[PDB]
Amino acid sequence: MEQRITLKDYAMRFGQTKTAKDLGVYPSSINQAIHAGRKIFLTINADGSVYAEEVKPFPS
Amino acid sequence: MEQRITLKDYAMRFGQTKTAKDLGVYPSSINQAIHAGRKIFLTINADGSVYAEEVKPFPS
Ligand SMILES: [Cl-]
Ligand SMILES: [Li+]
């Protein structure tokens, strides 16, 4: 069973550096995304690999 | 949210004209987005307001 949690919740546990490493982004990107309230969801596989997706408005 | 359905399902249920009007876009935008297979979902709120979102990987 994979877990699925918000970006903010992952960072609240793991901190921004690890979150950034696990998603392949810069730490600033994690900070900005949380501050902006972007709708980003992290699927955490049982081995603790992470895949993220974002839910964006349509139209832009 | 009271209901949430795919863009294609919304169009089948309600038709292109209403779909486009509900999102404030031109009909061609609906038709093309469905033809492109974009991962778009429409939310119908209890007050009757409708909005759409697209799911994309993060990061791009
Ligand atoms: Cl940074
Ligand atoms: Li969460």
UniProtKB/Swiss-Prot annotation, chains A, B:
Keywords assigned: DNA-binding, Early protein, Latency-replication decision, Repressor, Transcription, Transcription regulation, Viral latency, Viral latency initiation and maintenance
Effect annotated for changing A33W: Loss of dimerization
Pfam families: Cro
Superkingdom assignment: Viruses
Chain segments annotated as transmembrane: none
Quaternary structure, from the entry: Binds DNA as a homodimer.
Function in brief: Plays an essential role in the switch from lysogenic to lytic state and in fine-tuning the lytic phase activation. Mediates the de-repression of the lytic promoters from repression by cI at an early stage of prophage induction. Turns down the expression of the transcriptional activator cII, a factor that initiates the expression of repressor cI, the major component promoting latency. Additionally, cro is able to directly bind to the promoter region of cI thereby preventing the transcription of cI repressor.
Entries under InterPro entries matching the protein: Cro-like (IPR000655), Cro_sf (IPR038202), Lambda_DNA-bd_dom_sf (IPR010982)
GO BP terms: latency-replication decision; negative regulation of transcription by competitive promoter binding; negative regulation of viral transcription; release from viral latency; response to UV
Gene Ontology molecular function terms on file: core promoter sequence-specific DNA binding; DNA binding; protein homodimerization activity
DNA-binding region ranges: 16-35
Gene3D superfamilies per record: CRO Repressor
Protein name: Regulatory protein cro
Effect of F58D: Loss of dimerization
